[PDB]
Amino acid sequence: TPMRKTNPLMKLINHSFIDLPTPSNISAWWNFGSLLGACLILQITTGLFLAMHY
Amino acid sequence: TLTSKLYSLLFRRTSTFALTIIVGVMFFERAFDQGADAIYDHINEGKLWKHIKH
Amino acid sequence: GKWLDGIRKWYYNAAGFNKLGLMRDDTIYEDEDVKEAIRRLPENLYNDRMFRIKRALDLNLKHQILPKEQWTKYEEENFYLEPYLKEVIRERKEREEWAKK
Amino acid sequence: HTDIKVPDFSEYRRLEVLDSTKSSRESSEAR
Amino acid sequence: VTRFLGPRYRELVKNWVPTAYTWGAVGAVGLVWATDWRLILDWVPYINGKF
Amino acid sequence: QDLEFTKLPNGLVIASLENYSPVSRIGLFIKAGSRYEDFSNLGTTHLLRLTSSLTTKGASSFKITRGIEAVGGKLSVTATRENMAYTVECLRGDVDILMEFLLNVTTAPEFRRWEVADLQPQLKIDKAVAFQNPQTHVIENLHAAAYRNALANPLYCPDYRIGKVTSEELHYFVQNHFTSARMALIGLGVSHPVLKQVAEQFLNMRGGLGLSGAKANYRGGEIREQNGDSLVHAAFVAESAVAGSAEANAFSVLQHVLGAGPHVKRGSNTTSHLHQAVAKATQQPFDVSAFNASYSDSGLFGIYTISQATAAGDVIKAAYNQVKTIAQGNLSNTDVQAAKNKLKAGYLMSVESSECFLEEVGSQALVAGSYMPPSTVLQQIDSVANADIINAAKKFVSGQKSMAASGNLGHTPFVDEL
Amino acid sequence: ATFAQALQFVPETQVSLLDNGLRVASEQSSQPTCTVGVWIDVGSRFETEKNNGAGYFLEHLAFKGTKNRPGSALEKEVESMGAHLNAYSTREHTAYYIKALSKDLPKAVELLGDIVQNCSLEDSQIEKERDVILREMQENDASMRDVVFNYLHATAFQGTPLAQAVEGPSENVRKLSRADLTEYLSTHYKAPRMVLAAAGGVEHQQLLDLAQKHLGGIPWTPCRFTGSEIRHRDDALPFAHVAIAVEGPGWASPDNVALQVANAIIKLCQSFQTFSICYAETGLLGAHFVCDRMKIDDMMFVLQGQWMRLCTSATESEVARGKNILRNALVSHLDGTTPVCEDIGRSLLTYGRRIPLAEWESRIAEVDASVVREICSKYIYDQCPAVAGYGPIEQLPDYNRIRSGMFWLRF
Structure with missing residues (x-):
């Protein structure tokens, strides 16, 4: 199994961002x-x- | 052929790809900055104080 | 009748789901009743609906449209999901009517 | 199952520069 | 560490040495470029705009 | 060169050849088999042949597997209802390591209970994949429905015994059946002196006999497996003669008269009387053969048919009638010679491959102790006369039938009807 | 003695050239049986769209009748001799062989001539073969491994004539007239495009005489790999089948041995195998595995990780193990009259000569860990693959994911 599916932080990142099932027609x-x-980050x-300085 | 040596030497291993990317970043930064500065100085020549101080 | 049919045909053509090869029942919102009605569909109808929806999604992703010949025709449309959905809604309303007594 | 014929993709393939003696490996490297 | 003392690991290190050298060069040149060290950026033929 | 079935003082029959093939092949044939187990330890042999790679007293499971792979050889275990063969194949210069591995696997296995428990689920998968072809399943049901004591024991462990084969049963079976006098060491590529040396390594093997028992009593029973399959596989059999007898040769020649298998790619089996009869019997696709197995205690000659359910009965009936016609004496001399040619060619072509030659030599060493050259086999086949074949057909027709069927079974006749 | 000495013990395969061009090859042995066959350098690759199923149809009806004797007579003679008459057809080769007794060597050879030179194409037999083949295609549709490999070939070669299946489409076999089969026979079954190869207990002089007698009447006289994918989804099927491949060198290439060693070097997968299908100028090197619906991604990851490890970090012990495995497979495969006869015919068809086992051992000995990793990087690393998946195929990574997995960011 890939390391992304073993480490819990990597588990969360892969499940929510890397391998998230997303519609193709979006x-x-x-x-x-x-x-x-x-924008928020900015x-x-x-x-x-x-x-x-403020 | 150009590619037969280029891709085999530079684009084959990703580490060499990153190395040539960074070298190109240095050279592009220098040359692009110089060209943009030259363009901006020429477009508004005389107005800038770098010319006046002479 | 004739006037109402003309208006309905105009609305069907205006709504673009026929351009993508879809039928009207493919467009219905997938709520619980529609989910059970889909589950009750026969395998052939379920597979046909799945392929039509997938083809529509693929076309929408390509920002393309099926050729005008292949468009679904208002006069040649099947309301395959209507009986199943009506039966599911009838059963749910019967359950609610019993549960309110 | 023998109806495996892939629909023609020639309209999407990268326009080859020329019909030279370039090997498929060389063309893939160039692309 | 004891398990790593063997010929196979030596062969693996020999195989990965070019990759390690290339990544070290990547890191070093990236640091020099980002910080504009100019201790090193004076030797390079071009990139002599730091008059 | 030629083989020489040298018997060691303990009882280990050692045979060696000198085929100069780069792969050296060695085979340890033990007289242990599924027939030698009983109701108490039913299905033990099925797990026993899956524990070849388990850790032994002198070698570990990891060591065995990695050494066998790195050498490039293979260690396989074949099993029948009477014999069990451990066959190891290696390069010419890599014999000692794999021979020691074989010694450790057979003479001194160490069935660690956790390893046995981990291996037990593999029994389900092996049984399922082996039952994928209907022939094996129907033959297993046929052996269960034909014999009652010894040969009725299945080659694959019963479903209820899949998860309850304790390592104690494995140890008991090994130490009561893997004994020197019931084993034979055969080496094809291995020259005779090194074969003697490895046999000397085998010299201190258990005792000098085993717990051989049972007699494979025959019952005219039937097993019916009602399934939803459109195609039905049936096999009805009668007790033939024991293996290694002139009557066994007669039954084999009879089976080749009836038609054992195809001889032309996509052929219609023009020579096969059974195929011709079933062709006019039914028009849907079919497959008819004359099943024939021979054992030390008994034998089974019969008809196996794969047909459509709705036609099943008809098919088998036609096949049955054919044998009946041969029983009446309607057996010409031309088809007899054709069947004899088929049998001789089949035997010789089977002997071609080194694996099958090794298996044949091991079986002969186990049951006879002296090698039977193919010329003698051909002479014995030619010795069979038409009257002997008619007698074999009469014995099949008059004997008590045992049948096993699987499929829709809506039209298959029972044993009494057949 | 040693492995090398044992290879030297192997008898050579005498080869002779007839006037018409037929190449007669033999390997004498002490076995009492033999296998004599004709290998024709004609396959599905040489068939246009009009006659995609021509070779397969001819393979079907070849044993069902020749001009000299009807098909019933031919089959009856084969059965009476005790021999087995078999045939096969690949996308690049065709073969009709007879496994017989040594003393039956003459007749069998004559039989082969009757099968090849004068084949009787009975119209009734042709229609019967049509019906049988229409049934057979639907039967073969059940076997999903062959379907997957056909998908892989079709997607990998596409426009190339190497992508069409050997069987051919249903419409093609339905419309395949007798004249088309006769034209295919006339344009394809001709020396020197044919090899008569025998093994076992056969003397090369006897085989040459028989070939001149019965096979002397024979008339004297751009492949492109596209890294595409196909996925046929069928969730009702229990397990998913996947076959992923990359371009491989043809028969005439020294890199084949190194690739064989690499494949031998290569458990989440229920059944995982590695294939190195070689053709004239192209080839498919890859893996075919069966999977559960929920484990396709992990198995693909493991296979690609093994590929990358071989391409980058190939240690000496693993390469030595692969070489030993390849040697054992090579020697064990050439056991029996039929395998060696098939090897003789195919080797004469593809390599030329017979590439004896001593040369194979020397070539394997040349192979080294550095050579293995170099050739793997040459053919596997950062290459666009061809993927074929038979349902239930949903967890199979998208083609972009597979292509990205075909290279390492660490390297």
Whole structure:
């Protein structure tokens, strides 16, 4: 068995992200959700560097 | 043939692929930065103070 | 009748599920009653529905459409899931009516 | 089961540069 | 460690030595590029913009 | 060169050849078999031949497997209702290691209970895959329905015994049946002196006889297996003569008169009387053969038919009638000579492969102790006369029948009807 | 004595060339039986779409009648002699052989001539063969391993004539007229495209005389691998079948031995096997395994990991074990008159000469761990594969996943 299916953190990552059954006909709109998370990350990172001087 | 040596030497092993990627990153960074700076300086020549200070 | 049939045909053509080779019952939302109705379908109808849905998904992924000749025709459509779904809904309503007495 | 004929994919295959004596291995390496 | 003392492991290390060297070079050049060390980036023929 | 069945003082019959083939083949044929077990330890032999790779007193399971693989040879175990063969095949320069492995596997096995428990589930899979072809299943039911004491014991462990074969039973069977006087060591590539040396390694083997028992009493019973299969396989048999007898040769020549198997790819079996009879009997696809097995205590000559259920009876009836016609005396001389040619050619062509030659030599050493050259076999086959074949057919027709069938069984006649 | 000495003990196979071109080969031995056969360098690869099933149909009706004697007479003679008449057809080879007694060597050879030179194509027999073959295709549909291998060939070679099955489509066999079979025979069954090979108790001079007598009347005179995939889903089937392969070198290539050693080097899988199917200029090197519905991904991962380990980290002990396994398989396969006769015919058809066992041992001895890993990287590493899956195929990784697994990011 691959290491991704043995380590519990790797288990979670593989099950939720690497090997998640996803419809093939999904259009571009479903991208935005992922983008949202990225935006959040940006707001968490960039804003953090703003807090160091505000 | 070009590919018969290129792919066999550089793109065969992924480690060599990463190595040539990083070397290309260095060279591209230098050359692209120089070219973009030259373009920006030429487009607004005279306005910039690097020319005025002379 | 004739006027209503014309409006219904216009709506069927306007709704694009026929372009993808689908039938009306393939479009119905998969809730519990529809799930059991699908489970009650005969194997041939179940396989035909599965292939039609898969072909529609493949076409939608390619952003393509089945050729105009192969489009489902409003005058030549089978409501295969209607009897099974009606029976399931009837049984559920009977259970609820008994459970409210 | 003998109806194994794969539908034609020629309209999607990478347009070969020329019909040279290049071996299939060399063409795969180039692609 | 005792189990690894054998000819087969020596052959394996010999096989993987080129890969280890290539990855070490990748890491070193990546560090030099990211930090712009300029101790090393002065020797390279190009990339002499650090006047 | 030629073989020489030298018998060691303990009782181990040692035979060697000098075929210069690069693969040296060795075979230890023990007289132990499924017939030598009883109701108490039924199915022991089936697990016994699956424990070849288990750890022994002198070698471990891992050591045995890895050494056999690295050498490139193979250690296999073949089993019949009377004999059990351990056959080891290696390169010419790699004989000693695998011979020691064979010694450890046979003379001093160590049936670790956990290993036996882990191996036991393999019995289900082996039985299932071996029952995939209907012939084996029907023949097993036929042996169960024909004999009652010894040969009725199945080659594959019964379903109820799959998970309850204790290692104590394995040890008891090995130490009561794997004895020097009931074993024979045969080496094809191995030259005689090294074969003598490995036999000397085998010199201190258990005792000098085993718990041989039973007599394989015959019952006219029948086993019916009602299944949903469209095709039905039936096999009805009568007691023939023991193996190694002139009457056994007569029964074999009779089976080749009736038709044992195909001779032309996709052929219609024009010579086969049974195939011709069933062709006019039924039009759907069929397959008819004259089953014939011979043993030390008894024998079984009969008809095996694979047909459609709706026609089943008809088919077998036709086949039966054919033998009856031969019993009446309607046996010409041309087809007799054709069958004799078929038998001689089949024997000689079977002997071609080194594996089958080794098996034949081992069986002869176990049951006779002196090698029978193929010329003598051909002479004995030619000795069979038409009257002897008619007598064999009469014995089959007049004898008590035992039948085993499997399939839809909606039209198959019972033993009394057949 | 030693392995090398034992190989030297093997008798050579005398080869002679007739005037028409027929190549008669033999291997004398002391056995009382023999197997004499005709191997024709004609197969499904040489058949266009119009006659895809021509060779198979001719294999069917070859024993059902010749001009000199009716099919019943031919079969009756074979049975009376005690011999066994058999035939097979591959995508590149055809063979009709007779396993007989040594003293029956003359007649058998004559028989082969009657099968080859003057074959009687009875129209009634042709229709009967049509019906039988239509039944046989549906029968073979049950066997899913052969279906998987046919899928693999079809998806791997596609446009190449090497992808069509030996049996041919149902519509092709239905419409395959007698004239088409006669034209196929005329254009294909001709010397020197044929080899008469015998083994066992046969003298080469006797075989040559018989060939001149009965086989002298014979008339004197771009393959492309596409890494595609096919998956036929059928969840009712108990187990899933998978066959994954990559391009392999043809018969004429020194790398075949190293690839054989690598395959020998190669349990989640219920039944897992490795195949090295070789052709003229192409080939399929890969593995076929049967799986549970829930374990396809793990088995594919294990197989590809073994492939990558061989391509990158091939130690000496494993290569030595593979070489020993290959030697044992080579020697054990050539046991019996039929296997050696088939080897003689095929080797004359593909390699030329007979490639004696001593050369095979020397070539295997040349093989080294470095050679094994180099050739594996040459043919296996980072190569687009051809995949064929027979249902229930759902957990089988998508083609992009398989292709990505065909290489290592660590390497």
